[PDB]
Write a protein that binds this ligand. Structure first.
Ligand code: SF4
Ligand code: SF4
Ligand code: SF4
Lengths: 373, 176, 52, 52, 170, 49, 301, 177
């Protein structure tokens, strides 16, 4: 006997192609939502009690898969944290390499978010273009380090493979100037039409006091009135000698949290163009010769370190503690989307129509491998 | 600090401006016809393993840095890498002291459901004469072992190569 | 309708299935789930002419 | 001006009947309708008379 | 430097707050266990609104789940690490929930309760199947009393479709 | 007063003005073969009489 | 016996050109965002695949008969519109008949989508029926604008009145009905701006969310005939084909060119425009195309 | 009779877009404007009936192996899954997981495995091309082993997580409404 008789519970499970892999059970009322709780954790590999059993250097390759769209931001934060507890002397060349791959993976993640938004917003042309122009960035990464995604690159000191040379650094100038001439054809399909602007207007109204104390750390609370950019507040890599300008709006409906990410794509591509004309000087790619050998037996002195870094969706931190041996005692990777599309999504879908459940789901850039950890 | 707009980012919606996304009705479509236009992958793409049988000392230094615990050791004391649990991270390359564990660009490896084609994933990697199976034999970039005939109680695996040597050797004992 | 039945009445397995086991975005669904909608059915139609 | 509203009336005449035949006749049945029978004959004579 | 002034301003408003300032902005300090609830809103109202993950390390030698609490700033950019030390038994695994002051800890406490140990009193989303459905909810797999490779063997009989022994360590 | 006509005429003129940017890029290309195709199309109309 | 073979000729030609028209839609939407995409003879292989299973579903006794009625209605729609000179009947092809017999496919593809019983099929039918509500406000005014500009309703007395004098997208009181039809055609088809009776991605697939093997094959036949019937109804009214076998085949060829013509402008709009919320789809078909067709209706009178 | 349908299958394989977690970063650009699949006719649609090519993209959580086997129970005849990555083969790097399911052939019948982490789309092209070669003659694949050899898979399904999921993952919400 069906014991609700009032509210039908359709729910977007995994096989839906709008939500990626996290089920949101929606207590629908005709065509609105009156209660939207989420069941995440269809992907819980475990990384607390799973990355505690590997040595310190080889715990990179196992830690990449905590966030799929950015295959460099999870390694470049753990590489920043093990940098601190040992206290290396990571040179200028390794700092520049890690800077440029941390920004080119970010423009890859923005392009993937555009393609993921357009696959569920109906319009396929902004999806196919976004994946096509992400593919040349993948084929440019493949010259450098290894595979397309999950390029195990940034070991705790420095990097693993340096630049090929003028065949590569001239090529990045070509694709960045190409995509900066190309980006004016994304506006006319995704941000200038009177469909999308009339589709995402006023849905999911996020207040100003509802973002800073809620768990939101990304660029989407920056569309609400909040002045917080971790690249600007505490620059970590070769950021202070860049002088980029960050966007802040006083709005907070859903399309405010989309135009801010479009402008972040524009200024980040201007960063990669500005970083390239600097060019890296000489130096080694590794950090030190004597305190790296016998690579499993890598006793680190005890203590702890926190690091945190800007992402496509949320400034998400790592937490490593070292007992004093060749094992991370606990490496916690705080997912960006833990209270960023699970808890704030519960008070965002209440009242919204069914057509703007997937669009709201992508207007926060919900990536399901981050809630589980 | 350095807030960029006041209303500079927010643009104006527009009726018939999406017709400028219609420009690619006549340009050349950007795709690769994979049967048969090849891609030529990178000169140092991470792929399969090319252990050298004359420099390997069996010190199991790779055994303790594999993140997925598949470089388990055999006797005649070389390792067999299984690609069942292996992420191609190539931490076993720059940690092997002698240098007897390389990596070459070979990634295409498709096997079917039967177990006799699934013994294909347990190979003691062969010498770098397998680079003469990447070139000089039909440059297809595929795994040049292509069937393995294990035999119980007469343990003599046979890497039946593309047309080369059958590469027989006995395997007795595992671990250390 | 005959020519439409010619293109359907062709056999090849027409096995009947229960209703309680259905899509539900590829998920298990029991008998105590109100899955057929029965509450106002036209909420955008009411909210379109909410002035009228 | 008058042909538009009567044609809209044929559309909205179509619409509500789809609303009727949905949550009364299709979908799952609740577990209080297992104690029900068929149609009785004297209503069925009227149904057959109006149908022919 | 400015973090030393900030922690000096915090220590005026709280006695049990022994603040060590790491590199420039990593202001880490420990408080006693059942005193942070009357303390975290001193940290909220001063300058630190946003709360990151309630990450909790374990220690089997001295039995205590050291729940460190990550706070952050928005006007300066620092990141507090206020930490407690509560006992390790499931009987004594008690901790008052911070939901009246932080709505950030509505969901962080669900993960730290479903993963290992700690039970939070004044919250409603406690026995909800957040993550780790049955039969993984019945034992807490993220402490040090739960060892891998003796539960995985009792859940899956073989770990290698192939040969000899790829299920041990090192 | 939420339904003004100042807004509608600016809408219809901005539509004509963006159609002016539309016909500029479509008909008037750098592709020489596009104008060859235009000549072949109007010759095809002269076939159609 | 000869009208039976001629009707079989028309239904089998409508099959083997409607599937190619849907494949042309797939080819142009492939080239519209830089991809080769499928071959031209693609959805024939879709239909040929979907009749080669070994299990089906058949939720109910009505779950079959609804989509079979949809196929029968969409065949009845194309039987009256004058496909060239070869018509099984040209005495009665009235406007209201063909206009209402496009909507009856949107019954039977949904009336049997309800018998499955699903919140996805329920909310797909919920978001499909507000279209068929909203689209008949500019559709009826387009039919009145065609009506009062000519007077006759037998559709052989319209293509005759076109091939006698004038075209029909000219003469501005009739062109304002064509823009209303050009906007209503994307909804009546299921193309991307007014997509929502298909909705691939936002909801799962709406009405056709779980059909199975044979039922999706009947849907592909019905969808190709809905394409061909509404396109031939637009071309044999607003364009007019009209017109020995070397005359007849060329008549049907130039009719096919005018079939592709409105189908070409149905695709260019229908990829650069995202999907529409059904609450705005009810609000859009009363603001702009209604006043356009109303100005056409008072200028045709 | 038979080859009129046999060639028709290997030209319009409809894939269902499960996007199984880690691995949905080389499932989309496989089917987009670059190295593509619509040239092979591989048109994706999210329906558990209108598909016959399931891509188990990487690992399988047992909170997803319920959903995968429920999706796999609904494709009528020509369902054959293409295992992906290196997770389904023997367990990937998550062999040390209480969750991530090792040895996928013991639960649902895999047709063809690929290798790679992540597998490059050229390897997926080689996998589908070998799947076309396998489906030409027709080679006793999955859907022909899930039918007669059901006694083994149903026992191995019920042994891991089992006891009738249709009451465990259905009654898990009705108190928590
Ligand atoms: S290939 Fe990578 S994962 Fe495999 S054994 Fe070598 S280092 Fe370990
Ligand atoms: S490759 Fe290196 S670690 Fe492995 S057996 Fe040979 S010498 Fe030892
Ligand atoms: S095969 Fe590799 S990339 Fe794929 S899910 Fe497994 S570990 Fe991740």
């Amino acid at each position: 006997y069906p014991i609700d008789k009032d509210t039908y519970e359709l729910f977007f499970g995994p096989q839906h192609m709008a939500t990626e892999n996290f089920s949101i059970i929606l207590k629908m009322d005709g065509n609105r939502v009156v209660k939207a709780i989420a069941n995440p954790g269809f992907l819980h590999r475990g990384f607390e009690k799973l990355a505690e059993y590997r040595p310190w250097y080889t715990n990179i390759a196992l830690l990449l898969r905590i966030c799929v769209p950015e295959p460099d931001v999870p390694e470049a934060i753990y590489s920043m944290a093990v940098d601190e507890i040992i206290g290396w002397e990571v040179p200028e060349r390794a700092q520049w390499i890690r800077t440029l791959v941390l920004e080119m993976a970010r423009v890859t993640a923005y392009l993937f978010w555009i393609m993921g938004l357009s696959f569920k917003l109906g319009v396929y042309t902004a999806g196919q273009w976004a994946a096509a122009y992400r593919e040349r960035f993948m084929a440019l990464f493949e010259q450098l380090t290894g595979a397309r995604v999950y390029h195990i690159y940034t070991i705790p000191g420095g990097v693993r493979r340096d630049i090929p040379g003028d065949k590569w650094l001239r090529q990045v100038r070509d694709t960045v100037e190409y995509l900066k001439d190309k980006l004016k054809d994304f506006d006319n399909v995704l941000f200038e039409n009177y469909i999308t602007y009339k589709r995402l207007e006023g849905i999911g109204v996020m207040d100003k006091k509802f973002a800073l104390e809620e768990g939101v750390t990304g660029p989407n609370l920056r569309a609400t009135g909040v002045a917080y950019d971790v690249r600007k507040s505490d620059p970590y890599l070769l950021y202070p000698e860049l002088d980029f300008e960050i966007p802040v709006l006083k709005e907070g409906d859903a399309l405010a949290r989309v135009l801010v990410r479009r402008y972040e794509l524009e200024q980040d591509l201007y960063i990669i163009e500005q970083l390239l004309d600097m060019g890296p000087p000489s130096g080694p790619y590794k950090v030190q010769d004597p305190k790296l050998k016998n690579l499993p037996r890598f006793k680190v002195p005890p203590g702890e370190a926190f690091a945190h870094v800007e992402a496509t969706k949320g400034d998400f931190g790592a937490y490593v503690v070292s007992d004093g041996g060749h094992k991370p005692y606990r490496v916690h990777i705080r997912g960006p989307s833990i209270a960023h599309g699970v808890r704030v999504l519960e008070q965002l879908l209440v009242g919204a129509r069914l057509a703007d459940v997937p669009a709201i789901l992508m207007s926060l850039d919900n990536c399901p491998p981050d809630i589980d950890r | 600090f350095r807030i960029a707009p006041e209303e500079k980012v927010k643009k104006k919606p527009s009726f018939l401006k999406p017709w400028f996304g219609l420009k690619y009705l006549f340009k050349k479509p950007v795709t690769i016809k994979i049967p048969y236009e090849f891609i030529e992958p990178a000169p140092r793409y991470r792929g399969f393993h090319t252990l050298d049988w004359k420099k390997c000392i069996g010190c199991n230094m790779c055994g303790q840095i594999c993140p997925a615990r598949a470089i388990e050791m055999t006797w005649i004391p070389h390792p067999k890498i299984d690609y069942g649990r292996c992420t191609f991270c190539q931490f076993c390359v720059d940690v092997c002291p002698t240098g007897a564990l390389g990596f070459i660009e070979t990634y295409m490896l498709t096997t079917t459901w039967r177990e006799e084609e699934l013994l294909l994933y347990d190979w003691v990697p062969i010498e770098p004469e397998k680079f003469k199976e990447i070139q000089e034999k039909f440059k297809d970039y595929k795994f040049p072992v292509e069937k393995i005939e294990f035999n119980k109680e007469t343990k003599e695996v046979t890497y039946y190569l593309r047309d080369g040597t059958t590469f027989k050797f006995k395997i007795l004992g595992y671990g250390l | 309708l005959i020519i439409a039945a010619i293109l359907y009445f062709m056999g090849a397995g027409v096995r009947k299935v229960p209703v309680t086991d259905t899509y539900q975005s590829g998920n298990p669904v029991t008998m105590e789930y109100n899955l057929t909608i029965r509450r106002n059915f036209f909420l955008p139609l009411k909210e379109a002419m909410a002035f009228w | 001006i008058l042909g538009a509203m009567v044609f809209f009336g044929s559309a909205i005449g179509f619409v509500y009947l789809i609303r009727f035949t949905y949550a009364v006749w299709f979908g799952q049945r609740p577990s209080d309708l297992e104690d029900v029978k068929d149609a009785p004959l004297p209503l069925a004579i009227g149904m057959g008379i109006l149908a022919i | 430097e400015k973090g030393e002034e900030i922690v000096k301003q915090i220590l005026e408003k709280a006695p049990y707050a022994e603040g060590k300032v790491r590199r420039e902005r990593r202001l880490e300090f420990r408080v006693p266990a059942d005193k942070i609830r009357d303390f975290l809103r001193i940290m909220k109202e001063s300058n630190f609104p946003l709360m990151l993950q309630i990450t909790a390390v374990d220690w089997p030698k001295e039995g205590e789940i050291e729940l460190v609490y990550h706070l952050i700033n928005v006007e300066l950019g620092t990141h507090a690490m206020v930490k407690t030390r509560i006992p390790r038994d499931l009987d004594k695994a008690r901790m008052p929930t911070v939901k009246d002051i932080y709505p950030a800890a509505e969901t962080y406490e669900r993960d730290v309760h479903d993963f290992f140990g700690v039970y939070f009193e004044g919250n409603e989303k406690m026995e909800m199947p957040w993550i780790l459905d049955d039969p993984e909810r019945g034992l807490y797999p993220h402490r040090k009393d739960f060892d891998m490779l003796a539960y995985v063997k009792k859940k899956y009989k073989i770990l290698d479709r192939f040969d000899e022994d790829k299920d041990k360590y090192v | 007063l939420k339904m003004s006509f100042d807004r509608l005429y600016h809408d219809i003129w901005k539509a004509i003005e963006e159609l002016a940017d539309l016909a500029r890029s479509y008909v008037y290309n750098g592709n020489i073969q596009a104008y060859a195709w235009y000549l072949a199309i109007i010759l095809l109309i002269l076939v159609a009489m | 016996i000869g009208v039976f073979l001629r009707a079989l000729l028309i239904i089998i030609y409508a099959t083997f050109v409607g599937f190619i028209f849907m494949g042309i839609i797939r080819k142009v939407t492939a080239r519209i965002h830089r991809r080769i995409g499928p071959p031209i003879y693609q959805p024939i292989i879709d239909t040929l695949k979907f009749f080669g299973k070994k299990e089906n579903i058949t939720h109910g006794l009505i779950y079959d008969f609804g989509i079979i009625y949809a196929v029968g209605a969409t065949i009845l729609a194309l039987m009256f519109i004058p496909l060239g000179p070869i018509s099984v009947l040209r005495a009665y092809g009235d406007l209201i008949l063909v206009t209402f017999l496009l909507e009856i496919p949107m019954l039977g593809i949904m009336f049997a989508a309800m018998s499955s019983g699903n919140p996805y099929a329920g909310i797909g039918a919920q978001r499909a029926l507000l279209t068929l509500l909203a689209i008949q406000v500019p559709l009826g005014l387009a039919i009145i604008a065609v009506a009062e500009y000519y007077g006759t309703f037998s559709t052989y007395e319209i293509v005759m009145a076109q091939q006698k004098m004038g075209w029909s997208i000219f003469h501005l009181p009739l062109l304002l009905a064509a823009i209303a039809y050009d906007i209503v055609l994307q909804a009546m088809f299921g193309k991307e701006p007014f997509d929502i009776m298909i909705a691939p991605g936002e909801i799962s697939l709406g009405p056709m969310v779980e059909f199975g093997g044979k039922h999706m094959g009947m849907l592909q036949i019905q969808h190709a005939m809905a394409l061909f019937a509404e396109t031939l109804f637009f071309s044999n009214i607003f364009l007019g084909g009209g017109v020995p076998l070397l005359n007849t085949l060329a008549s049907l060829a130039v009719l096919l060119v005018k079939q592709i013509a409105v189908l070409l402008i149905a695709i260019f709009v229908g990829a650069i425009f995202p999907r529409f919320t059904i609450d705005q789809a009810a609000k859009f078909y009363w603001k702009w195309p209604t006043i356009i067709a109303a100005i056409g209706a008072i200028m045709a009178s | 009779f038979e080859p009129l349908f046999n060639w028709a299958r290997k030209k319009s394989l409809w894939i269902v877009a499960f996007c199984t977690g880690c691995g949905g970063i080389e499932m989309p650009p496989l089917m987009t404007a670059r190295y593509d699949l619509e040239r092979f006719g591989i048109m994706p649609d999210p329906s558990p009936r209108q598909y016959d090519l399931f891509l188990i993209t990487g690992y399988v959580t047992p909170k997803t192996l319920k959903r995968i086997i429920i999706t796999y129970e609904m494709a009528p005849d020509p369902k054959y899954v293409l295992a992906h990555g290196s997770c389904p083969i023997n367990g990937g790097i998550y062999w040390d997981a209480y969750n991530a399911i090792k040895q996928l052939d013991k639960y649902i019948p895999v047709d063809v495995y690929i290798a790679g982490c992540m597998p490059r789309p050229e390897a997926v092209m080689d996998g589908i091309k070998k799947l076309m070669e396998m489906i030409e003659n027709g080679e006793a694949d999955g859907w022909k082993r899930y039918k007669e050899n059901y006694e083994w898979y149903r026992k191995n399904q019920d042994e891991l997580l089992g006891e009738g999921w249709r009451e465990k993952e259905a009654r898990k919400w009705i108190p928590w409404l």
